[PDB]
Amino acid sequence: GSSGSSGSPLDRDPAFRVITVTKETGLGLKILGGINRNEGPLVYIHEVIPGGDCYKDGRLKPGDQLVSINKESMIGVSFEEAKSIITRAKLRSESPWEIAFIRSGPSSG
């Protein structure tokens, strides 16, 4: 059957949500954590820079756990890497920004 449980490096989350942010100038998003950093190994939104693509979206916020941007991996990655991807992303292209993270919170009742 299936083997694992206890603990694992990679494993898609149940509340894993994926959205898209209208790309115009560039990502303009900050990340936190890093297998080397203290906030890691998980990666989260350090802060939404005022004047970015996501900034306008709002869907995302500072503190949310990221998963992958554009088409890379943010889970269990190097703080510099995740950040290196944003600026390395397509940028100034035609397709929007592929944002993947986990969404889940108390709503109503």
Curated annotation (Swiss-Prot):
Compartmental location: Cytoplasm
Post-translational modification: Phosphorylated on Ser-95 by PKB/AKT2 after insulin treatment. Phosphorylation on Ser-95 abolishes the interaction with STX4A.
Expression (tissue specificity): Detected in skeletal muscle, heart, testis, adipocytes and pancreatic islet cells.
Post-translational modification Phosphoserine, affected residues: S8, S95
Residues annotated as domain PDZ: 15-101
Function recorded in the entry: Plays a role in the translocation of transport vesicles from the cytoplasm to the plasma membrane. Inhibits the translocation of SLC2A4 from intracellular vesicles to the plasma membrane by STX4A binding and preventing the interaction between STX4A and VAMP2. Stimulation with insulin disrupts the interaction with STX4A, leading to increased levels of SLC2A4 at the plasma membrane. May also play a role in the regulation of insulin release by pancreatic beta cells after stimulation by glucose.
Subunit structure: Interacts with STX4A.
Protein name: Syntaxin-binding protein 4
